[PDB]
Design a protein around this nucleic acid. Structure first.
Lengths: 79, 93, 98, 107, 83, 98, 93, 106
DNA sequence: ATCAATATCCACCTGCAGATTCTACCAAAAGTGTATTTGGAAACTGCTCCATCAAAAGGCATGTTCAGCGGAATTCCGCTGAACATGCCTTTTGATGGAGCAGTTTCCAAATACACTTTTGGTAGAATCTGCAGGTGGATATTGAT
DNA sequence: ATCAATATCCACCTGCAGATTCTACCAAAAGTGTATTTGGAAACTGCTCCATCAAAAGGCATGTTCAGCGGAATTCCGCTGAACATGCCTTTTGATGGAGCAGTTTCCAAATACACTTTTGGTAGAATCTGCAGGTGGATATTGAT
């Protein structure tokens, strides 16, 4: 399954950037679930903007706009 | 004179619970609630319109605006009452 | 017969990655998830390549910061190992939970 | 001369909602459906919370809803609590709730 | 016709009481000054913005609505001293 | 000796205060704190009696919710005594100085 | 056409660090920034009108709004830059 | 025809800012004093970041600014970091920082 | 302290993906000038509600005493993560139809702007109504000492 | 585990502040009805750029081995807190002078609304330039074993 696509070593690299020194084992699945919830919430709003504009193509801007209506504003993709 | 949705909230209060009142302190809160929710939706709908180079917020904006702002089932039963008040209005002319 | 002690490699990795800005999750795997999740909100969708990317940048940017708080959470309980309860804690207090 | 609210089956003043929509400057023009839809949604959301409030007031043997009741209703309802996750209801107190690990005795 | 040194009026007893509503059981002794410190900062930010809305309307009386709009700017919408 | 053990009066207060709404800060002293802090921002100010009440309701609400996150933070270090570092962690994670 | 602040970001970039440049993705960030600060300041200036029941969003409002949005020193200097630019404009033909 | 921008002495489009203000539905009327001020304020702030980002790059022996350089410049200034506290600059990485209680025992 | 295996630095090198430069087309700006309109500052002032002094009294803060027990310090060790080298299954990179995202045109249902008519939701104010605060007492726990 | 000291629960009872109920004026709303304007759905289409495939690339999955982290058990010091005596200062019921918010009417400096002209920032195809990203080499600092 795709969620397992986000691999342990990837997760290990993320945390590192966060300055993590030692990582429990369960962290990997906990991180997966959190990443999903994150995505679902974001993509849900993104796709909603899509269906409002009447397209079948999620756009950079739909994502930006979604990421905005939360206090997750993103710089570097138009808008 | 300062308007408030007070009489309207009251009318509805009597619909759900015929024998229940509401102190003026609570009514005030309800007033801040209708108002707060109003701005929030109109706003999101304001933004939705510009994102699409649009000059009139219609019931379609309002809706999406409501699906983006409210949570799960709440969105759904709000969207229905939405659609239903419109459809009925629309045949009354 | 040469071996580095546990943590000496970790500490060098932290240094390594806080210095680079490249994405840490592999794009394909990631793009499958973005598509998999979306399929549940609307069928047969297409993504602009710059859309999936804005999505990754935001996702890792998000995750990184969270580990930061998770780590502070472990350190707070006098540990160096982050655990599930650390994340959960950082999320509850952030408001993402309850 | 029927009010627009009656035309739509609502209690909430479509006439008002509509007017406010204009003076708020959310856009150049405003559909004629917008005001109706909105008012309908507002009315629904105030009916949802009042329902819960009324109930909360019943559990406390009261006939008149007070601040505390609107809060008990909101904070006890998953969704409403989210919709008002950054709202602070004056004179509302909080949900009774003591952490598990703080209770005396064992087992 | 006087002066100003107010954050001691935030009594130990009152700070206890607020800790309770928060579900707190045991309080450290250094909590009291830390709390006072936190509260002040908080009051400063709100009152600062609050008074800004006041000045800007060329008034000399901080209103309820001023505090409210200020409380909204800081993500703490307050319900009910007038919508 | 009929003396309640320590921890029994606490839980009694917890239940007590969570059951009510009334404000926990002596009104007058809070009011001076408002006029003290405001005055040092701009002199010659006047507050509507309702303005001050709002600042209280709002401050108490904040603090109250601040403790919960604090309390959660001590329990995390395996304690029941909230300490400054707890308030401090919550404030950090919260983005109040993170 | 797809407007953007690219080109005014480059004219400024050159008064500060003449010999310095800036990649594409970086100019994209600075466009997003000028829009963020624009929409932010705009909005608060908008509200500032509405609260005070005024149909005009004048320079005055922009001020108060920059005072609410920007952090201390940052606002001190932004408030001046602003008063300087408005003074230099009025006192001209 | 010697301008609105040049008149106020700015590099930022006073006319464009004024057209964006009207068309954003922020108010029924837009004084002429608003776009100028605002324009001036947008320039200043942009000069401010470029200044710091310009330095950041010098410090790394580079003449061209990238995301990496705007981030180290924004997260290292107390004020801007606050102003963009909830903003994520794509491809900006994070500041170098290792919790002391994680460094070697020495 | 003395090697021994690695990791990190730095000075130099150069191919190229990305940034700079010049030309030419043009819809959309943005400036300019005339005519009409009006938002909201100014001057006057009604009247609300804020600052403030007064006095009495008990709610509640303050400060001390004294013991319960929580939390940090310390020793101990079971077992979980981390380092590492082995092997290839998946991602990454570059070539290609076609699905749509947009650019343009048409034109009608639907949204202004304008003149009236009529219904209504504030509210200023005198008067009657009623839920429940808060004082009371006693049945039922909930604790703590033994 | 039975006892004694207390706090909690809880239904009855009644003064009363806050509320549900008018009679009357109404400016501000909302609704009715042409006349005029136009935003955007809709049909058609060219140019993107997004999905798909196959070959080249390099990160990951796995099992052994053991450092050492972090939970458990033990201990005791000193802090936090329950109980209590004392009395201050917050809380309350009032009343008063007047600051200053807010309603009304006046009137012009500034904003809107076309109409006509000049410039300009954005796009597209072609050519040429360059900052620095990886690659190599050799020096040396870092870390781990003895």
């Amino acid at each position: 399954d795709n969620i397992q696509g986000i691999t342990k070593p990837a997760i290990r690299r993320l945390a590192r950037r966060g300055g993590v020194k030692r990582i429990s084992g369960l962290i990997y699945e906990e991180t997966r679930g959190v990443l999903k919830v994150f995505l679902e919430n974001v993509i849900r709003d993104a796709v909603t903007y899509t269906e409002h504009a009447k397209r079948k193509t999620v756009t950079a801007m739909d994502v930006v706009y979604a990421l905005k209506r939360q206090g997750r504003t993103l710089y570097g993709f138009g808008g | 004179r300062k308007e408030s949705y007070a009489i309207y909230v009251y009318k509805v209060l009597k619909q759900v619970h015929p024998d229940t009142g509401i102190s003026s302190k609570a009514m005030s809160i309800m007033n801040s609630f209708v108002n707060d929710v109003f701005e929030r939706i109109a706003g999101e709908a304001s933004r939705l319109a510009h994102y699409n180079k649009r000059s009139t917020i219609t019931s379609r904006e309002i809706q999406t605006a409501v699906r983006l702002l409210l949570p799960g089932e709440l969105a759904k039963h709000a969207v229905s009452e939405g659609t239903k008040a419109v459809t009925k209005y629309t045949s009354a002319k | 017969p040469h071996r580095y002690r546990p943590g000496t490699v970790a500490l060098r990795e932290i240094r390594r990655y806080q210095e680079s800005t490249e994405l840490l999750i592999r794009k394909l795997p990631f793009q499958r998830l973005v598509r998999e999740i979306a399929q549940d909100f609307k069928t047969d969708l297409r993504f602009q390549s710059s859309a999936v990317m804005a999505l990754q940048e935001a996702s890792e940017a998000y995750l990184v910061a969270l580990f930061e708080d998770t780590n502070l959470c472990a350190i707070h309980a006098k540990r160096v190992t982050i655990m599930p309860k650390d994340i959960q804690l950082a999320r509850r207090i952030r408001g993402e939970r309850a | 001369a029927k009010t627009r609210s009656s035309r739509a089956g609502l209690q909430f003043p479509v006439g008002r909602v509509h007017r406010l929509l204009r003076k708020g400057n959310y856009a150049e023009r405003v559909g004629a459906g917008a005001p109706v839809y909105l008012a309908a949604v507002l009315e629904y959301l105030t009916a949802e919370i009042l329902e819960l409030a009324g109930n909360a007031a019943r559990d406390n043997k009261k006939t008149r809803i007070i601040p505390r009741h609107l809060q008990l209703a909101v904070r006890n309802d998953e969704e409403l609590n989210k919709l008002l996750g950054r709202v602070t209801i004056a004179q509302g107190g909080v949900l009774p709730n003591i952490q598990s690990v703080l209770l005396p005795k064992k087992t």
